[model samples]
Target chain A: SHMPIQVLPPQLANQIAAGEVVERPASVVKELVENSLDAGATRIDIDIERGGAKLIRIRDNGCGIKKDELALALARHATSKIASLDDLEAIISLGFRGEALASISSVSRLTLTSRTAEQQEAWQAYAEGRDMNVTVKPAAHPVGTTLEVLDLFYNTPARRKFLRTEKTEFNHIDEIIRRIALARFDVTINLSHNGKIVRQYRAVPEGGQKERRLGAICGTAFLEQALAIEWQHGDLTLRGWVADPNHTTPALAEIQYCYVNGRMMRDRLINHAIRQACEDKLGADQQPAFVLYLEIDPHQVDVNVHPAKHEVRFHQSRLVHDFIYQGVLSVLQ
Target chain B: SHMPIQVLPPQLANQIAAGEVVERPASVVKELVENSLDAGATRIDIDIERGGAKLIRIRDNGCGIKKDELALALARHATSKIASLDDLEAIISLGFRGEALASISSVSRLTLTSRTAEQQEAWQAYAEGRDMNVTVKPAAHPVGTTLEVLDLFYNTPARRKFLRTEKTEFNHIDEIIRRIALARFDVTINLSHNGKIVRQYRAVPEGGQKERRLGAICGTAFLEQALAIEWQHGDLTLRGWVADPNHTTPALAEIQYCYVNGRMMRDRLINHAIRQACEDKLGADQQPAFVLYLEIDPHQVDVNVHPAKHEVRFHQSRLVHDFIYQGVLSVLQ
Candidate 1:
C-alpha cells in the first residue's frame, strides 16, 4: 500500500520548510536580525533563553510594521519586500520570501508586535499552529517592532532532539551576530542571555573608533598583525584588513569574512582565490585572517539560489575570482 | 523615479538562466554526460573541438527519448522524472530540473537524435535561438541517444568572449570527466579532442578492477598513498578510499571525490570534517585526499537547490558532519 498524492497540511508543509530555513537556534537569530537590518534599524537588541531553545526575543528600532500588515507579514509567501521577479533578481533588501516568519512560527510559539510611526499604538499578532488563524490585538509599544520566538521545534520532537549543547547554540548565534556586526559598524547591537548583557556594541563611525570596534570583534592581536588593503579595478572595490605576510591567524581553517555589497557570503571561489594568493606567496602552511569587503553592482551577482542565502553565484565568477586573487597577491608582493 | 517592472522576454530570460547553468564548455559537458548517465547509459563517448568552444558531441547507449516527445523534451519545465514533492525528496537521478537540455539549447546550436527500443525509427530535435522554435525530423540511430552542441554562447558574444583559453577549458572538462568516472566505475567512458583520443576508460566491477578504475581516474600515486575505508552506523554507510595517514596526495589542497547516493556533491561541512579528522591525526598543513562514497536515505538530503546540481543540503547537516568526522577520525586514530 502507498499513500495517495495530496497537498500537505499547512503546518506540516511549514515544518518541512523549516528544515531548510530554521536549522538551529542560530539560524533563527540570523533570520530575525537580517529582517531587522532590512527594516532600516540603527539599533538592535536580542535576548536568549536557554540558548534560544526555550525563547528568543529580537527587538529592533526601525521602520515598524503597520497594524494592518502584521498578519500578512507572518503568512507564507506574503511579503512587503518583493513584488516582482525583477525585484527578486535585483534584491536590495534581505528576507524577501517571507519564509522566515512563517517557517519560524510553525515550529515555535511566535509573537509579532509592531507600531508604525503614524500609528497610535502597537499591534500584536500570533498564529494558531498551521491553520494560520492570526489574532491581532492592540498593545503598547514604541514606533518599532519586537518579535519573540519561543520553544523552537517544540512541536516537532524529531527535530528538537537534534540540537546540541546550550553553549554550542549560543556560540553559533554569537557568531552570526558578530558577522552582522562586522558588516554594519554603525549599528549598536545588544545581545544577552539569562538577563545579563553579554555583548554591548556601541555605534562606530569611520575613524579611530572603527579600529577599536574591529579590535573588539576580531581581537587586539589581529588588529596588530593586520595590514589594511585597498584595491580598485573596473567596477569592483576590495578593501579590508588582512593578516600581514607570514603571520598566522588565530585558527587555520576559516576566520575570514568577505561581504559582497553588504551581504555576507562565503563562496568557495572567493575562498579559493584568497587561498591561491596566500599559498603562492606565504607558502601552504600559514593560515591568513581577513575582514574583506567587495563592492560590486547588485545585478552582477545572484543570491536567490541558496535557501539561507550563504552562497551566491556571480555572473562573472571567474573574473571576480581572478580579480580577488590578483588583488591579494599584489598587496602581499 | 523608480523604473516600472516588466516581465523579461522569454529568450532573454532563457539566456539569463543559461548564464547560471551553462557557465562554460566544461559545464556543458557535465550537463550532457549527467543526462546520459541519467538515461541509463552503460557506455558513453565524448568528442570536443577547440576545447568544446567550437563543438561538443556525446553518444550514450542509454534509454532514449520517444519520437513523439522529441520537441517536448527540448522544452523547459517538462520532465519524465518525479511528479510529486514526495518523489522530489527522494530523487535518485542526476538531471531532474528538465532545464539542462533547454538551457543548453538556448545557449548553443544543439542537435539531439535518439531511438528507444520500442521505436522503429529515430528522431532528431533542434531549436532556433531566441525563437525557441524546435524542429524535429526522422533520423537514423541505434536504440540510444546522441547529443551535439556547437558554438556555445555563439548568440551571446559577451558570454562567448568570457571563455578561457583552449588549454584551460580542456582541463576543466577533463577534471569533470575524471570526477564522474571516479563515481561510476561500472560505466565505460571514452574521450577525444581534436580527432585524437585523450582517455579510454573501461567498465570495472569490484575488487582489483575497481582499484584500477580508481587508479586510472585519480593517478596511481593516490592508490599507493590511500587507505580503503568502510564504516556503517545505523542507516548510513561511508565507504571509499582515503589517503593514508602521514601520506600526501599528488596535489594537496583537495583532491576529493565525495558522492552522496550516486550524486556528486561538494559540501563545506563534509570537507571540513575530513580536514579536521586528518588535521587532528596529522598536522594543520596537510590536505586529506579521498574518493569517499556515502549512502543514506535520499529523503534526508535535498539536491534540487543548485542549477547544475553541484550542491546538496542535508536534513541533519550537523549529524552528517559529525558522523563523517567520527567515521574518518576513528579510522585515523
Candidate 2:
C-alpha cells in the first residue's frame, strides 16, 4: 500500500520543476529572455526552428557569465539573485528562482557560451547525461552570452506530445515577444523563424518612441483612441493608457496588458477594479481593454504568490484595487 | 552593470519554494493532510493553536516512514511518488511534487516521529540551523506518523505579516478540512483548535454513509435540492452533484467543489463548462452551485501545470469541456 520515500535523482527533480517552468516553447523563450533582460541586455536576438521544437538560439549583448561560475549557473537552487529572505521580499529582478536554466537543461540539450568584460577569453559549457554533469571548454565570443537549446523535451517524449502545431507554437512564442517588447521600450529585440527575420523592434529612444512601439504592438488604432493616464498618489503610481469605452473596437478590446513594478502581470484584483469602474459605460458582455502599469512599494506586493510570478498578493489589496479604480475612472470621467 | 551569477544557499532556495507551497495556515493543512491520505491513512487528527501560527500537530494512522527514510522525506525534490516522466504523466497520488514537507520544514521548527510496521521502535527526526542539519533519535509511537510544526513563518517576518487575523486564518483551515472531507469519503478527520474539538468527521461506513457525509459537508438542504450526476462515457467519468438551478439559495450557491481524478481543483475550463450548462436555468445574477468529480485518463490532464497544483491544463481541453458540459446537461434535462 506504500513505497519507501527516496530522494529523486537530480535530473528527475529538475525535470519535475521543468513541468511547471517550461510549459511550452513560449515558456522557454520567456525564461531565457527574462534572464537576458535582468543581465542588463539592451539587445536580444532570438532564432527559432520548427517553432522552437527543433532548436532555440538566444543571443544577448548583456553582462556575460564568468568562467568559474558557468557550471554553477546550470545547477539547481543556485542563484546570484537573492541570498536572503529580505532580498526576496523586495525582488526587482525577473528571474530569482534560479531553477530555470537547470530545469530547461534537464529536458533539452542546452549549451551556454559567454565572456565577461574582465575575462580575456570566452568559455562555453554544456551538461550531459541523466546526472547533468556540466562540461566546460574554451570558446570565442564577445562581451555577451548566447544559449542554444536543441530538441526541446527530447528526453521527455510525453511532454513533446503536448506541443501544438508548428504554426500555433510559433504564434505563442511570437505573442511572448510582443509582451516582452511592450514591457521594455528601450530594449531592442529581433525575432527570426526558420532563418527568416520575422519581427524586429528597434530600441526606443526619447521623444514619442514609446508611443511608436505601442502602436506597433497594440496597433495604431489603440494608440490613437486610448486614453492616456498618468496618476500618482504618494508611493502608488499608475501610468499608461486605457481604451476609451466608446471607441473600443473589436481588435482593441483584446489589447489588455498590465504591469506591476516593471513586471507584466494579470492580477484579478486589478482587473475587477478596472472592470467595475467601467461598468456603467460598457455592455454586459464587453471586456475592458487597457495597457497599464502600477508602480507601488515592493514591500506591499508578494510576487512569490505564483511559480511563474504571473500573479501577486497585495498586502493592502483593497487599497491598491481602489487606487486603480479611481485612477481609471478619473481618466474616463 | 553586472552581478556575476552565483548559487543560492539551500536554505534560501527552500524558503523561496515555500512561498508558493505554504501560503497560509490553510495551505500547510492542505499539503500535510494530502500527504497523510497518500500514505493510506484512514484516520487523521489535526491540532491547531493560534490559527496555526503558534503550532500545528498532525497525527496519522497509516503506513509509517521507515527510520532510515525519515530524514530523506524532509528533503526537497525527494519523493516516492514518481521516478520518471512516465510517472508524472500519469500521477495517481495527490502529493507528487515531494516539495511540501521540505518547504514547510524550512519555515518552521518541524518534528517528525514515525514507526514502520517492521521497525522495533519509532524514530524522531528534526532539522536545525541555516543548513538544515537533520538529527534523529529513538522515540515511542505506534505504526504511524506524527508531524508537528511550531511558529509558522518564524524566520520570514514578511510572510508572517501577510497572514490574516487568527479567526480568518482558522476559518481558512476549517474550509480546507471541509474540502478534503468531501474529497475522501472513507477517511476520518478530527480537527481541534486550542486543544478543544472544533470539528469531528467520523470514519464514514458503507451503505447510505456516503450520502450522509455529503449532506454533512454540503448541508441537508443542498443534498435534497441537488441533482446527483453520475455520467460515464468511454474513459471519462463524471460523478457527484450539482445544484438544481431552481433551488440554488445564497448559502447553496457557494457550494462549488470540483475534483479531477480525486484531486480538488479550481480550474477555469471546468468552471466555465458547468456555468454554461446552468446558464438558461440560472438568473443572470445567480451563480451555479456544484460538487463535481470528473475522472479521466490521468494522461488527459496535466497536473504539473501549477506549482501548487491548483490549476491543470487539459490535453484535449475541448473534449473534456464538452464532456463535462454534456454530463451536467444530461442530469439537468
Candidate 3:
C-alpha cells in the first residue's frame, strides 16, 4: 500500500553518513589520522594535493588489517573498537563509529593497502565509484597501512562546489595536524603539500623535551610567557598552559585550544569556564590564549554525541565546569 | 586471522546512530513532530510526562501507514523523502536521514500504530527491547498515526543519568515546539504536559492575522515596535521583522530567531550577518532582537551537513551573507 518508504540503497546510506563525517578535506584527514593513532601507529605521514580536493594520502606504521578483513573494514558499521553495550559505555578507542572508511570511499576513489607483521605480503582493497563494489588484490607494502583518497567529491558536484580556495583548505588541514600534534607529543607526524615537505614533528619522549615541542606548535613567545597550569582533584586532572595575562601576545590571544582525555574539543562549556576566569582581567574584546588538557574518568564522559566526535557530554557538567574555572583562576592568581 | 574486525550487532548500531539524532527528550520531540509535518499532517498533538523521561506520545492526523509497511517504517535508513542521489542533492523534507524512528525506537519503548485510508483495519508495530524483533498486530484506530514512547533511556542508565531535572527537560521540549510553531504557522500544534494542556496554536491560513500570531510568540511589545524588513534580489527574498533599534525592549533583546526556506536555523553564517549589521549600533554585550526569514533556491543550500539538520552550507555563502546584511541594515537605517 505504501511505496514512498523503503530502505535506502547502501551507496546512498553511506553518502548520508559521509555528509556528517566528511564535511571537507580537513574532516577526512582528522578521521584517518585518528584511526592510525588507534591502530598504535608511532610515525604517520600525511600528503595533500590541491588542498585534499585532488588527493590525500596517509601512511602509518600501525597494526595492519588482515587480508580477509579488508573488504569488511571498507563496509559501514564494521569496527573492532566495541562489540557490546558494555564496551560502548567505556569506549577508549578513537574510531568507534566505523563508517569513516565507508563514507570516504563512497565520495572519493579510495584504496586501502595494508600488511600485518606476520603476513608474507601485503594486500589492497578499492571500492568502485557510486556502486561501492570493493575488490581486493595482492599488493606490496611494509608492515603497516596506507589509505589513498583521490578526487574528493568528484561524483558529487553539488558538494564539490562548497570547497574553498586551495590555500584556505590546506590551512584547515594544517590546523587539524596541529591539534593532533598537541594531543600526542610521543607520536611522529610529518606533512607534505604538493610534494613539498612542510612540517616534520619528531617524537618527544616522556623523559624530557616538552618545552621545545610546545615552542614549535604554539610559538616560542608562548612557551616563554605561558604559565604552567597543573591541578588535580581525585580522578580529574587539568594540565597545560594559559598565556600569562601580563605578557599575553597577539599570537597568544589566538591560540585557545583545549583537549579532554587527549581529544581536541572546541566545546562551549570549557570555553565559558575559561572566559569566566579571565573576564575581570582581560578586556571585553580580548580572549586569553591557552592550550589546556582535561583528564577524567572515561565513564563520566560520553563521546558518541556527534558523528565526528567533536563534542562530548559530561555526566557532571557543572562539576567539570567549576573544576576548570578554579584551575584557571588559581593559575592566574 | 583477524578476530577484531566485524560488523556491529544491529541493536548496538542503532544505539550509535541514536547517539547523534536523539540527544535528549527535546530531540525526540523534534524528530517526531518533523515526521508528522512531512507526512502532510495538519494537526499534531504532543504529550509529555516527567520531562519525557517516563513517556512521550505523539498523535498526528496525517496520512497513515499501511499495514505491510509498518515494520519497514521502524527500520533504519527507511524513508520516503529521497530515493536517489538526485533527490538527496535538493532535499525538501525535514526527516531525510530516515534513521530517526529506528534510532529513537532502539533507545526507548516505542509503539507505532496507524491505519491508511484504504485499509479496513489498523496495524500496530513494536520492536522487542534490545532485540529489535518487530511484531505486528491488528488494532482499532482512526485513519491516522500514533507513536507512543515510554521509559526513555530505561535500558541505558548511563544515558538516563545525563538527564537534568524534570522542569529543565520540559523547557527544552517547549522550545522545540516554539521553533516548529514559528516555522509552520499553518499547522495546528497542541501540547500538553502531564495531562494538562499547556499550548494550543490554532491553524492560521494565508488570509491575514499574522500580527496576532507574532504578538503571541514574540510578545505584543515587539509587534508594536518591530520594523518590517522586506527585500528581494532575483530568486532570493528576505522577509521578517527586526526590533526597532531605538525601541528595543529587554524581552526583544533576547528574541533572535532566523529561518531559511521555512526551516529554522541558528547557523553561524546567518548569525554573523545579522551581528555585523547591528555591531556598530548595539553595545558589545547587547544583541538585537529579530525574527527574519530568507527564501532561496533549495538547490543552492546543502542540508546534509549535520544529522539534526541544524546547520546548512550555502553554495553562495558570501552572496547570502551580504544579502542578509543589506536587508537588515536597510530596515535598521
Q: Please rank every candidate by DockQ, starting with the best.
A: 3, 2, 1
Question: How do all the candidates rank in terms of TM-score, highest first?
Answer: 3, 2, 1
Deviation from native of the Cα of residue A315 in model 1, angstroms: 8.6
Q: Which lDDT tens digits does candidate 3 get at residues A1-333?
A: 234789898888888989998999999999999989998999999999999999999999999999988999999899988888888888878878778999999888899999999899899998875568889999999999999999999988899999999999999999999989989989999999999999989989877677777899989989987888999998899999988766776768888899988899888999888878777555553577889999988889998899999899999999999999899889888
Q: Specify the poorest-scoring 10-residue window by lDDT in model 1 chain B.
A: B1-10
Model 2 spans with C-alpha error above 4 angstroms: A280-285, B280-286
Q: Is candidate 1 or candidate 2 better by TM-score?
A: 2
Clashing pairs in 3: none
User: For this target, which candidate reaches the highest TM-score against the unseen true structure?
Assistant: 3
Cα lDDT tens digits, model 2, A281-301, are 565535778899999988888
How do the residues B174-225 of candidate 2 rate in per-residue lDDT, one tens digit apiece? 9999989998888999999998999878878775457788888888899898
What is residue B204's positional error in candidate 2, in angstroms? 2.0
After superposition, the stretches of candidate 1 with alpha carbons farther than 4 Å from their true spots are A1-23, A47-162, A192-197, A205-208, A219-255, A267-285, A296-333, B1-23, B47-61, B64-162, B192-197, B205-208, B219-255, B266-290, B296-333
Better of 1 and 3 by lDDT: 3
- Quote model 3's TM-score for chain B: 0.95
